Amino acid sequence: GFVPIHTIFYSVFHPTEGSKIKYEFPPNNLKNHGINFNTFKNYIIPKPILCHKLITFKYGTYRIVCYPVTINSPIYARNFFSFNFVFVFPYDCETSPYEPAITRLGKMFKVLEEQNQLLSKSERDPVFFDFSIQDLLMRIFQDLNNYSECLIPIDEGNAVDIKIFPLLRPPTTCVSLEDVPLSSVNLKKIIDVNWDPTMMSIVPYIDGLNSIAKISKLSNSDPGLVIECIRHLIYYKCVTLSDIFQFSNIYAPSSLIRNFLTDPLMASDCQSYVTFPEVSKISNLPLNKFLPTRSCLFDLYRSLSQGQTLKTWYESKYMILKENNIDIRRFITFGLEKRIIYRCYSFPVMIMPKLSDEEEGILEESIRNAETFDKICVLLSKPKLEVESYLNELGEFKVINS
Amino acid sequence: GPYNSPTFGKSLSLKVDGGFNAVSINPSGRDIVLASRQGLYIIDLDDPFTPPRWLHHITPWQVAD
Amino acid sequence: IMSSSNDGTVKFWDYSKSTTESKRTVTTNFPIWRGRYLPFGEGYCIMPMVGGNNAVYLINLCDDNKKTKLQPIYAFKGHSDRVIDFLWRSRHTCDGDYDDREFQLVTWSKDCDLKLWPISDSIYGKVNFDRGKRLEEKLPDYDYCSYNKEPENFRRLRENFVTTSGLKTNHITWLSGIRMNIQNLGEEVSAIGHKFPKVVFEKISVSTRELCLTLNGPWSEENPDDYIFLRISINFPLNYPNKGDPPKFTIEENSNLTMSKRQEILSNLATIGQKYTDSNLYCLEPCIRFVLGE
Amino acid sequence: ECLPNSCLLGVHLVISTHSGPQIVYHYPPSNTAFLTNEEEDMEVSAMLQDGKISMNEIFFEEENFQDINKILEFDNDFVAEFCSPEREMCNTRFEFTVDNFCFLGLPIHVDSQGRWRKSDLGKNMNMFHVCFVMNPHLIEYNKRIDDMYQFVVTRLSLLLRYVQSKTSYISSECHIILKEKERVLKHSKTYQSIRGAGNKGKYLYQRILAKSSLARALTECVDKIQRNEIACLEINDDKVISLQIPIQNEFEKMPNFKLQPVLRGSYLTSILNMKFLEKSDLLNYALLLLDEPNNIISSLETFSYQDDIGTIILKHLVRNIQPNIPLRSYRYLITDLLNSLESSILRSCALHLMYWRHARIVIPLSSKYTYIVSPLAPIQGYTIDDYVPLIYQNSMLFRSKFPSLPSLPIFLSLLSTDKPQAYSNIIPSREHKPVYLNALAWLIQYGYVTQLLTFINIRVDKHIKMAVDEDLEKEFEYDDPEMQHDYTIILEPERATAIEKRWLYRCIYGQPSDIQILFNKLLKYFNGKVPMELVIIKEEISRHDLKKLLNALDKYLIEIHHW
């Protein structure tokens, strides 16, 4: 997860012999590994333009992270005081979780040196003017290499409190109204007092089959804040988006359909998932007026095809689901959750009551943006047939089931 | 029994890659557990040839004890 | 109470007498990461933190403020990188009449090495440990059951949905790190598995001395260029590889393999195993290199 | 992130001498806010008219200009100070981050003996550094810096080292750049007659680009890497270098649409370039040009200067190409121009075309193959990486290319409203067949339409098991329900046991000998992972034989259809 520190050393600019290493843990670690401080001493203590900046550079097989600090005051010799708490890491890692810690350590020591002249007086030599460093470096090194955390008191009111956090990918901006959210965790037990009220309103409506517009209307929420809350929950890797379930939808098998075969516990979960708890009434309705075996579930997963809607697929195979007591919505949801099937979205590209002005405006904007049938149906709060009738009144259109 | 073990009176070295930070032992001497950020490895000390049992727990922070 | 700090000082305390100062103070040239009392005899065991040759030091504690230096008895040399913990392994009689228990030091280091250290009777005598003594209280008895094996326990119809054989490089890389300090069966198996990446191992069990490996061999009578999938199951005796104790080779019944060719392959494998066990060498690499290739 | 983003902000040319480090030519001279959020006049006019000078005018606007002496709140001498390291930090990877700006480059330093390579400014110079500034995000920093250093910086610095060792080219380029800077800043009255510092810098850069060849190389490199294109650079008028960062637009498994954005028009196929680039038979496949053939010829003429044998062979192969015929049949196109040497030349030319974003690899297109509309088809989105839509733009492009055919909505609806059949059911007549195959190639080359491949796995019911049990014995019970089968799917029939191989060889019991031979030759591929089109190509069988084996074996063969 987090890279261990290779060598921590505290470099200060002496007014007589220039930049030098004061303390270094492990002792003589840089010279044993062929790292010569005089080669990059002009980067550790650079000009004040480069100071107070997150400096990270590569030296051979090692990456050297530092935050140079320069304080200008007439109390010090040569009218300035410069130091650097320098961290050495290997090159083949990610030093991104450690960079804010080193930056905040440098800023806190800048504050302490500007306040009470801690590091300058810690040298016990009156040539810099007109608590142990080595113990602090040992504690920082071993606490960050053994616990990824530290609480090291350096004074009667000052302590080094560093916690290394992982870096997460930012959420996408592709979330829209027609996407349904799937909560991968039980969100009711995660709710403490620090949650956002909007997110707290969203939580009792993420049931895996409600659209973001439907959740916004149910919770009396603006869709933009719901979009941002779903993005924040995506940022913590707990909600994955999906599609609105309709029988007018077209589902096709994906390339991962063999993972229904090459997995010891996927098919058993399918058996425990897709079946009604009792003999449901849907398993008694005609088409017009033990648990199911894993081979049956696989044969039902194969029989989906492109250009064939779920109504036609379900009316071609309805005795199988009636006899095996299979919920088709749960079947499709499990197929989408295991990424063994995908939905072919419908695109109404161009070459009944009187529709409103704003309704026809947003319909025209959706048509001119080549939006799907799901987004138009969500925006107009209408089924597919009314949208199709209004589009046929407006012009001639073709549907792509991609 | 514990007296038919082949590794008690002998010296033995095992290469366990993965970056394990913690270790603990049975007072009986049979199994040994190693802890890392990815989980637990349980090694038989009388049958070291068997690959250790991996119990999955992913954390970004280093385990302590 | 004993203590150890980063300055190199090992301090022994007795808070019934005085909270301030220490009964003893032992100074080392290295920082100490883990210091503990010995579980047997009168003594203590400290190990370094960043230097000190990365060796665990065993020091007697048998004497009368005393700022002294470190005078260890035994140093467990090894461990190219620093040691981060140490443990103890204890075994004894189940019933308990005399205190005859043996100890083994287990150390884990940053270079991904887990080492077991034997303790000699010289160490058992140098530390004031009375091996054999009437117990005031009987020692606890623990179950010796292993836990590396995987444990396991409308209705469901009984079915064989997918073939288990249609569903092992971690095993062959773990066995390379096993060193009983070719001198081992598992080391031989790992070396051959690293030598031949095309040979696929289906069942490696050094404890039960049974091997089952799959390969593609040029043993087709119809076409010499055709390669036939072969399953060979190998059973090793407990006296492998001594003379007169060859491994047992069993080839699975294959429709693509004729019975005469199967008997010829089995006879040549038995000949190779007997010829290499006659010199008390190891016979699994010549056998595999015979089955596929030469 | 799979979306391509070359994070360049500019380029440097930092050289060092005995007198100290300095700077020579940097481009663009723009500020941080824009990048983050006489006879010489006649010559530069002729070079701008002929297209020899390709600068970006937005870099020299009044609101997008910074002084020539300042680079990202740093002086020229400051940058030349911290980008000219010691000899131990030279001839190696120079990675250096200043907060969110990474100074990535490979500085070339002369050795102690005084040779640039191991086999005024010409002798004073001991180091030059073509420094590239990037600003990647912290989650994508390592990927961007690694791909840039592996694909642009290392190659450009090594070629510059070679041309400096053999010709002393960078020294002369720096000399003429400094001479032109002195002759524009202190001699030309045109410079003083031009209003605005941005236009003054634009004219100065126009003169530098007109007189210098290294400036043209760096300007074209920055402009064609920031635009995610192939950067063809002219160096010393004797060697050319082509630089690019490869684009991830091929995917075997389907990426998550609404969680990880992917370029619209990406190829959702199981046949990928990257599955073949990592191997470096490919000649069993056919190429598919990503643009018009004359555009590809125009792009490939910039890949060399002397029109050598490789460019002539590549031009002849591009001019005479068809996506419906395999590459093994094109040995005659290069036998006239001169396993086998022609096969090796064909393979090398195929790697050259498919590596440099010219001719993608496909299964050879036939009207008998089932073609479906890809989910990643460029329908939505104003452009390729948006996130008038692209469907209407490509419909206009389709109407321009095929004016005697129905529109792109009609073709994309006829292929995605019924069950996916063969492509021959859309073509009305045989006279329409070549133009319909050209339309199909146009759809595939734009990422609109992929292929629906057939995957076969083998399945065994209870009757085969009972027959195998009877054969094994050779060497409930009161009822017979016919809707309670005990099925089993043999996942990998190559590594089958004795009983499972008996199940496989009892699946073929009463079939004729040709079915027995075709089952035996195709048994190892019946695992649900190998598409049957590749089995047809590799095993030299026909489609009527395969459809015979599918019809004669219906309950035992699992049919899996994906791309």
Short mmCIF file of N, CA and C in Angstrom, two decimals, chain C residues 176-294:
data_model
loop_
_atom_site.label_atom_id
_atom_site.label_comp_id
_atom_site.label_asym_id
_atom_site.label_seq_id
_atom_site.Cartn_x
_atom_site.Cartn_y
_atom_site.Cartn_z
N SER C 176 10.47 -22.87 -3.67
CA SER C 176 11.85 -22.47 -3.93
C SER C 176 12.49 -21.85 -2.71
N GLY C 177 11.68 -21.22 -1.86
CA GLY C 177 12.15 -20.56 -0.67
C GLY C 177 12.33 -21.47 0.53
N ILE C 178 12.01 -22.74 0.40
CA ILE C 178 12.13 -23.69 1.50
C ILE C 178 13.57 -24.19 1.53
N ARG C 179 14.27 -23.96 2.65
CA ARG C 179 15.65 -24.40 2.83
C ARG C 179 15.79 -25.09 4.18
N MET C 180 16.06 -26.39 4.17
CA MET C 180 16.25 -27.14 5.41
C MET C 180 17.73 -27.08 5.75
N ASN C 181 18.13 -26.03 6.47
CA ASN C 181 19.52 -25.82 6.83
C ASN C 181 19.96 -26.77 7.94
N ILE C 182 21.05 -30.98 -4.59
CA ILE C 182 19.66 -31.18 -4.18
C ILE C 182 19.62 -31.99 -2.89
N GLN C 183 19.05 -31.41 -1.84
CA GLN C 183 18.97 -32.05 -0.53
C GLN C 183 17.54 -32.18 -0.02
N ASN C 184 16.54 -31.98 -0.87
CA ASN C 184 15.16 -32.05 -0.44
C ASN C 184 14.27 -32.42 -1.62
N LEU C 185 13.12 -33.02 -1.32
CA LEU C 185 12.16 -33.35 -2.36
C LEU C 185 11.45 -32.09 -2.86
N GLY C 186 11.04 -31.22 -1.94
CA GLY C 186 10.35 -30.00 -2.34
C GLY C 186 11.24 -29.04 -3.10
N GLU C 187 12.51 -28.96 -2.72
CA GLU C 187 13.47 -28.15 -3.46
C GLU C 187 13.69 -28.70 -4.87
N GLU C 188 13.74 -30.03 -5.00
CA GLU C 188 13.84 -30.66 -6.31
C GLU C 188 12.62 -30.35 -7.17
N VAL C 189 11.43 -30.46 -6.58
CA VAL C 189 10.19 -30.20 -7.31
C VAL C 189 10.13 -28.74 -7.77
N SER C 190 10.51 -27.81 -6.89
CA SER C 190 10.50 -26.40 -7.26
C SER C 190 11.54 -26.08 -8.32
N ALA C 191 12.73 -26.69 -8.23
CA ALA C 191 13.77 -26.45 -9.22
C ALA C 191 13.36 -26.98 -10.59
N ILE C 192 12.71 -28.14 -10.63
CA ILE C 192 12.25 -28.68 -11.91
C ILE C 192 11.09 -27.85 -12.46
N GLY C 193 10.18 -27.41 -11.59
CA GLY C 193 9.09 -26.54 -12.03
C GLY C 193 9.56 -25.20 -12.54
N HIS C 194 10.63 -24.66 -11.97
CA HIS C 194 11.23 -23.45 -12.51
C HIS C 194 12.02 -23.74 -13.78
N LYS C 195 12.54 -24.96 -13.91
CA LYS C 195 13.31 -25.33 -15.09
C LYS C 195 12.41 -25.54 -16.29
N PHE C 196 11.22 -26.10 -16.08
CA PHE C 196 10.29 -26.42 -17.16
C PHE C 196 9.00 -25.64 -16.96
N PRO C 197 8.85 -24.48 -17.60
CA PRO C 197 7.57 -23.75 -17.49
C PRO C 197 6.44 -24.38 -18.28
N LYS C 198 6.73 -25.23 -19.26
CA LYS C 198 5.67 -25.86 -20.04
C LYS C 198 4.98 -26.98 -19.28
N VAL C 199 5.68 -27.62 -18.35
CA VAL C 199 5.10 -28.71 -17.57
C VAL C 199 4.16 -28.11 -16.53
N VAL C 200 2.90 -28.54 -16.55
CA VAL C 200 1.87 -28.01 -15.66
C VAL C 200 1.67 -28.99 -14.52
N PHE C 201 1.80 -28.51 -13.29
CA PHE C 201 1.60 -29.34 -12.11
C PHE C 201 0.16 -29.23 -11.64
N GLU C 202 -0.48 -30.38 -11.44
CA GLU C 202 -1.86 -30.42 -10.96
C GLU C 202 -1.97 -30.74 -9.47
N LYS C 203 -1.05 -31.53 -8.93
CA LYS C 203 -1.10 -31.88 -7.51
C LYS C 203 0.32 -32.07 -7.01
N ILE C 204 0.78 -31.16 -6.15
CA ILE C 204 2.06 -31.28 -5.47
C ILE C 204 1.78 -31.47 -3.99
N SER C 205 2.27 -32.58 -3.43
CA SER C 205 2.09 -32.87 -2.00
C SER C 205 3.35 -33.57 -1.51
N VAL C 206 4.28 -32.78 -0.96
CA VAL C 206 5.53 -33.33 -0.44
C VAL C 206 5.29 -34.11 0.85
N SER C 207 4.31 -33.69 1.66
CA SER C 207 4.03 -34.37 2.92
C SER C 207 3.51 -35.78 2.70
N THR C 208 2.63 -35.97 1.72
CA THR C 208 2.13 -37.29 1.39
C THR C 208 2.96 -37.95 0.29
N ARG C 209 3.96 -37.23 -0.23
CA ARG C 209 4.93 -37.74 -1.21
C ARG C 209 4.26 -38.25 -2.48
N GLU C 210 3.21 -37.55 -2.90
CA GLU C 210 2.46 -37.88 -4.11
C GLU C 210 2.51 -36.69 -5.06
N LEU C 211 2.82 -36.96 -6.32
CA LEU C 211 2.91 -35.93 -7.35
C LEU C 211 2.04 -36.30 -8.53
N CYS C 212 1.38 -35.30 -9.11
CA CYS C 212 0.54 -35.48 -10.29
C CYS C 212 0.77 -34.30 -11.22
N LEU C 213 1.42 -34.55 -12.34
CA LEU C 213 1.84 -33.50 -13.26
C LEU C 213 1.36 -33.80 -14.67
N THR C 214 0.99 -32.75 -15.39
CA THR C 214 0.46 -32.84 -16.75
C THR C 214 1.40 -32.16 -17.73
N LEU C 215 1.56 -32.76 -18.91
CA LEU C 215 2.45 -32.21 -19.92
C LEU C 215 1.97 -32.63 -21.31
N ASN C 216 2.62 -32.06 -22.33
CA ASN C 216 2.38 -32.40 -23.73
C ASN C 216 3.63 -33.09 -24.27
N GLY C 217 3.52 -34.38 -24.55
CA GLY C 217 4.65 -35.15 -25.02
C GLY C 217 4.48 -35.67 -26.43
N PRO C 218 5.58 -35.75 -27.18
CA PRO C 218 5.54 -36.29 -28.56
C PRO C 218 5.59 -37.82 -28.56
N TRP C 219 4.45 -38.42 -28.23
CA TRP C 219 4.33 -39.88 -28.14
C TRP C 219 3.08 -40.35 -28.86
N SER C 220 2.88 -39.87 -30.08
CA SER C 220 1.75 -40.27 -30.92
C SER C 220 2.25 -41.22 -32.00
N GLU C 221 1.64 -42.41 -32.06
CA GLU C 221 2.05 -43.40 -33.05
C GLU C 221 1.56 -43.05 -34.45
N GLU C 222 0.45 -42.32 -34.55
CA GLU C 222 -0.09 -41.96 -35.86
C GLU C 222 0.80 -40.93 -36.55
N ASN C 223 1.20 -39.88 -35.82
CA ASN C 223 2.06 -38.84 -36.36
C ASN C 223 3.15 -38.54 -35.34
N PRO C 224 4.43 -38.60 -35.73
CA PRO C 224 5.50 -38.25 -34.78
C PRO C 224 5.52 -36.79 -34.37
N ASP C 225 4.96 -35.89 -35.18
CA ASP C 225 4.94 -34.48 -34.84
C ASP C 225 3.77 -34.10 -33.94
N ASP C 226 2.81 -35.00 -33.73
CA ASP C 226 1.67 -34.71 -32.87
C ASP C 226 2.05 -34.89 -31.41
N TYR C 227 1.59 -33.96 -30.57
CA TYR C 227 1.85 -33.99 -29.14
C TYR C 227 0.59 -34.44 -28.41
N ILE C 228 0.74 -35.41 -27.52
CA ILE C 228 -0.38 -36.00 -26.78
C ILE C 228 -0.34 -35.48 -25.35
N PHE C 229 -1.48 -34.99 -24.87
CA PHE C 229 -1.63 -34.65 -23.46
C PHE C 229 -1.54 -35.91 -22.61
N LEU C 230 -0.64 -35.90 -21.63
CA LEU C 230 -0.42 -37.06 -20.77
C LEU C 230 -0.57 -36.64 -19.32
N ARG C 231 -1.21 -37.51 -18.53
CA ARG C 231 -1.31 -37.34 -17.09
C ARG C 231 -0.52 -38.45 -16.41
N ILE C 232 0.53 -38.07 -15.69
CA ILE C 232 1.37 -39.01 -14.96
C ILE C 232 1.26 -38.68 -13.48
N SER C 233 0.90 -39.68 -12.68
CA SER C 233 0.83 -39.53 -11.23
C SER C 233 2.00 -40.28 -10.62
N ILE C 234 2.77 -39.59 -9.78
CA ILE C 234 4.01 -40.11 -9.22
C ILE C 234 3.86 -40.20 -7.71
N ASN C 235 4.17 -41.36 -7.15
CA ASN C 235 4.11 -41.59 -5.71
C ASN C 235 5.52 -41.85 -5.21
N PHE C 236 5.93 -41.10 -4.18
CA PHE C 236 7.28 -41.30 -3.67
C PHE C 236 7.25 -42.08 -2.36
N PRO C 237 8.22 -42.96 -2.14
CA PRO C 237 8.34 -43.62 -0.84
C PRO C 237 8.96 -42.69 0.19
N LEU C 238 8.86 -43.10 1.46
CA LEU C 238 9.45 -42.34 2.56
C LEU C 238 10.97 -42.44 2.58
N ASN C 239 11.54 -43.42 1.89
CA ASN C 239 12.99 -43.57 1.79
C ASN C 239 13.56 -43.03 0.49
N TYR C 240 12.77 -42.26 -0.26
CA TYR C 240 13.29 -41.58 -1.43
C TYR C 240 14.30 -40.51 -1.00
N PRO C 241 15.44 -40.39 -1.70
CA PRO C 241 15.91 -41.19 -2.83
C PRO C 241 17.00 -42.20 -2.48
N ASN C 242 16.86 -43.00 -1.42
CA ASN C 242 17.88 -44.00 -1.12
C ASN C 242 17.81 -45.16 -2.10
N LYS C 243 18.85 -45.98 -2.08
CA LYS C 243 18.95 -47.12 -2.99
C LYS C 243 17.92 -48.19 -2.65
N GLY C 244 17.29 -48.74 -3.69
CA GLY C 244 16.27 -49.74 -3.52
C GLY C 244 14.88 -49.21 -3.25
N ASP C 245 14.70 -47.89 -3.27
CA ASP C 245 13.41 -47.26 -3.02
C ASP C 245 13.12 -46.27 -4.15
N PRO C 246 12.67 -46.76 -5.30
CA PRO C 246 12.40 -45.86 -6.42
C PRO C 246 11.01 -45.24 -6.30
N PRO C 247 10.76 -44.13 -6.99
CA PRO C 247 9.39 -43.60 -7.04
C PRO C 247 8.49 -44.48 -7.90
N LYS C 248 7.20 -44.45 -7.58
CA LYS C 248 6.20 -45.22 -8.30
C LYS C 248 5.50 -44.33 -9.32
N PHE C 249 5.58 -44.71 -10.59
CA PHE C 249 4.98 -43.95 -11.68
C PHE C 249 3.70 -44.65 -12.13
N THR C 250 2.60 -43.91 -12.14
CA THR C 250 1.33 -44.40 -12.67
C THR C 250 0.84 -43.41 -13.72
N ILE C 251 0.58 -43.90 -14.93
CA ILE C 251 0.09 -43.08 -16.02
C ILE C 251 -1.40 -43.32 -16.16
N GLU C 252 -2.17 -42.23 -16.26
CA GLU C 252 -3.61 -42.33 -16.43
C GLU C 252 -3.95 -42.95 -17.78
N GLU C 253 -5.03 -43.73 -17.81
CA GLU C 253 -5.45 -44.43 -19.02
C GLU C 253 -5.91 -43.40 -20.05
N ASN C 254 -5.17 -43.30 -21.15
CA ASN C 254 -5.44 -42.32 -22.19
C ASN C 254 -5.84 -43.05 -23.47
N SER C 255 -6.92 -42.58 -24.10
CA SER C 255 -7.35 -43.16 -25.37
C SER C 255 -6.39 -42.82 -26.50
N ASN C 256 -5.73 -41.66 -26.43
CA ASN C 256 -4.80 -41.28 -27.49
C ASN C 256 -3.50 -42.06 -27.41
N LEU C 257 -3.20 -42.64 -26.25
CA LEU C 257 -1.95 -43.36 -26.03
C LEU C 257 -2.21 -44.86 -26.15
N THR C 258 -1.46 -45.52 -27.02
CA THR C 258 -1.59 -46.96 -27.17
C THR C 258 -0.99 -47.67 -25.96
N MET C 259 -1.46 -48.89 -25.72
CA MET C 259 -1.05 -49.64 -24.53
C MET C 259 0.41 -50.07 -24.63
N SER C 260 0.87 -50.40 -25.83
CA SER C 260 2.27 -50.78 -26.02
C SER C 260 3.20 -49.60 -25.76
N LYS C 261 2.83 -48.41 -26.27
CA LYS C 261 3.64 -47.22 -26.03
C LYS C 261 3.60 -46.83 -24.56
N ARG C 262 2.44 -47.00 -23.91
CA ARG C 262 2.33 -46.73 -22.48
C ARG C 262 3.22 -47.66 -21.66
N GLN C 263 3.24 -48.95 -22.02
CA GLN C 263 4.09 -49.91 -21.33
C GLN C 263 5.57 -49.62 -21.58
N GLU C 264 5.92 -49.20 -22.80
CA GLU C 264 7.30 -48.84 -23.10
C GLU C 264 7.74 -47.61 -22.31
N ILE C 265 6.87 -46.60 -22.22
CA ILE C 265 7.18 -45.39 -21.45
C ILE C 265 7.31 -45.72 -19.97
N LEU C 266 6.41 -46.55 -19.44
CA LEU C 266 6.47 -46.94 -18.03
C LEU C 266 7.73 -47.75 -17.72
N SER C 267 8.10 -48.66 -18.62
CA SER C 267 9.30 -49.46 -18.42
C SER C 267 10.56 -48.60 -18.49
N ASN C 268 10.60 -47.63 -19.40
CA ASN C 268 11.76 -46.75 -19.48
C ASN C 268 11.83 -45.81 -18.28
N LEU C 269 10.68 -45.36 -17.77
CA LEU C 269 10.66 -44.55 -16.56
C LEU C 269 11.13 -45.34 -15.35
N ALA C 270 10.70 -46.60 -15.23
CA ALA C 270 11.17 -47.45 -14.15
C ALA C 270 12.67 -47.73 -14.26
N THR C 271 13.16 -47.92 -15.49
CA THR C 271 14.59 -48.12 -15.71
C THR C 271 15.39 -46.89 -15.31
N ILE C 272 14.91 -45.70 -15.68
CA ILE C 272 15.60 -44.45 -15.34
C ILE C 272 15.59 -44.23 -13.83
N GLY C 273 14.44 -44.48 -13.18
CA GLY C 273 14.36 -44.33 -11.74
C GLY C 273 15.25 -45.31 -10.99
N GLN C 274 15.31 -46.56 -11.44
CA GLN C 274 16.18 -47.54 -10.80
C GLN C 274 17.65 -47.23 -11.05
N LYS C 275 17.98 -46.69 -12.22
CA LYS C 275 19.37 -46.39 -12.53
C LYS C 275 19.85 -45.16 -11.77
N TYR C 276 18.96 -44.20 -11.51
CA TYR C 276 19.38 -43.03 -10.76
C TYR C 276 19.27 -43.23 -9.25
N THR C 277 18.40 -44.12 -8.78
CA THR C 277 18.40 -44.47 -7.37
C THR C 277 19.48 -45.48 -7.03
N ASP C 278 20.08 -46.15 -8.02
CA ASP C 278 21.19 -47.05 -7.74
C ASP C 278 22.42 -46.27 -7.30
N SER C 279 22.59 -45.06 -7.81
CA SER C 279 23.65 -44.15 -7.39
C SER C 279 23.23 -43.24 -6.25
N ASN C 280 22.03 -43.46 -5.69
CA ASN C 280 21.44 -42.67 -4.61
C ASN C 280 21.32 -41.19 -4.98
N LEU C 281 20.98 -40.92 -6.24
CA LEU C 281 20.70 -39.58 -6.70
C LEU C 281 19.19 -39.36 -6.79
N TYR C 282 18.78 -38.22 -7.33
CA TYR C 282 17.38 -37.85 -7.45
C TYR C 282 16.91 -38.11 -8.87
N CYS C 283 15.74 -38.74 -9.01
CA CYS C 283 15.19 -39.06 -10.33
C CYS C 283 13.79 -38.45 -10.45
N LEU C 284 13.75 -37.18 -10.83
CA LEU C 284 12.52 -36.57 -11.33
C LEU C 284 12.75 -35.63 -12.51
N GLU C 285 13.94 -35.06 -12.65
CA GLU C 285 14.33 -34.24 -13.80
C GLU C 285 14.72 -35.09 -15.02
N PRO C 286 15.52 -36.18 -14.90
CA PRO C 286 15.68 -37.06 -16.07
C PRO C 286 14.39 -37.70 -16.55
N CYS C 287 13.49 -38.05 -15.63
CA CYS C 287 12.22 -38.65 -16.03
C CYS C 287 11.37 -37.67 -16.83
N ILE C 288 11.24 -36.44 -16.33
CA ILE C 288 10.44 -35.43 -17.01
C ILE C 288 11.08 -35.05 -18.34
N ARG C 289 12.41 -34.88 -18.36
CA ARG C 289 13.09 -34.60 -19.62
C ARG C 289 13.06 -35.78 -20.59
N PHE C 290 12.78 -36.99 -20.11
CA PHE C 290 12.56 -38.11 -21.02
C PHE C 290 11.14 -38.10 -21.59
N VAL C 291 10.14 -37.79 -20.76
CA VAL C 291 8.74 -37.92 -21.18
C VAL C 291 8.41 -36.93 -22.29
N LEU C 292 8.80 -35.67 -22.13
CA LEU C 292 8.74 -34.69 -23.21
C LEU C 292 10.15 -34.32 -23.62
N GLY C 293 10.40 -34.30 -24.93
CA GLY C 293 11.73 -34.06 -25.45
C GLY C 293 12.54 -35.33 -25.57
N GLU C 294 13.82 -35.27 -25.21
CA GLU C 294 14.69 -36.44 -25.27
C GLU C 294 14.37 -37.42 -24.15
#
